[PDB]
Amino acid sequence: VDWTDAERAAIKALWGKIDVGEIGPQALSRLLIVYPWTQRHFKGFGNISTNAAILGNAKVAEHGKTVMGGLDRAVQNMDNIKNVYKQLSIKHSEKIHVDPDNFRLLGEIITMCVGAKFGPSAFTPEIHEAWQKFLAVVVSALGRQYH
């Protein structure tokens, strides 16, 4: 939708600092810890029954990286997000049936993790702003089919 150069810049610039394999694992791990009902969706990850089980489980770390790769797909196609997320929508919302609001929760956890990594001087109100408009779009593109 309407992205400005200022927005693309801030977002691209931020995705470019982020180390996917580090923020991804931490984010997906927090989702599972802080909001434990999300665990029901990853029954195929094995041992995630305790918080240390979770923090150590390599399958969780692996999947956290897949999520960041999924986000990269959008940062790479910022003007067609909805169409390029054609598959991820269907999977999550037509097959798995993740309640929409969980997308927001993981979106928030990543932002928070992005925050704790870079600080208030890189993750400024201005960046934070472009970034949030970005996740709001991803979130919207991820859901649908359930209703």
Binding site: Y35, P36, W37, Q39, H97, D99, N102, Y146, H147
Partner: protein, 143 residues
């Protein structure tokens, strides 16, 4: 929080709709599965496809309404009186909290649909506050 007034309104409604609860619960559950298919994922062990006509659902219908009838009876301490349903839902089954809203809606829908003259605006407020408080008690064992 439920006020004493709120409790008094829920009590008058429940006493009035009791008995018919069994059909109301069959209806409520039966409608959630059909109208909000995302909820069916929690009942995939059940057989025939899930509507009011399947036995499992019609029997589980009376079940929920029985628990709800019991919540009304302990309206002064839903937390304490609901800790086992919470451990079952929030801990054992890992139900997404977002679904409590769905069942509640289908329940209020059924009530208004059965006792319309009695589900006045003020009652609708209290019964909605109660169901919201019920979900809160059930979300107790999540984290």
């Amino acid at each position: 929080s439920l006020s004493a007034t709120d409790k008094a309104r829920v009590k008058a409604l429940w006493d009035k709709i009791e008995g018919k609860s069994a059909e109301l619960g069959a209806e409520a559950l039966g409608r959630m599965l059909v109208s909000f298919p995302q909820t069916k994922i929690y009942f995939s062990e059940w057989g025939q496809d899930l509507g009011p006509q399947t036995p499992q659902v019609r029997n589980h219908g009376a079940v929920i309404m029985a628990a709800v009838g019991k919540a009304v009876k302990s309206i002064d301490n839903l937390v304490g009186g609901l800790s086992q349903l919470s451990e079952l839902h929030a801990f054992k089954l890992r139900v997404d909290p977002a679904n409590f809203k769905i069942l509640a809606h289908n329940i209020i829908l059924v009530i208004s649909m059965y006792f319309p003259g009695d589900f006045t605006p003020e009652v609708h407020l209290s019964v909605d506050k109660f169901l919201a408080c019920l979900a809160l008690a059930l979300s107790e064992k999540y984290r």
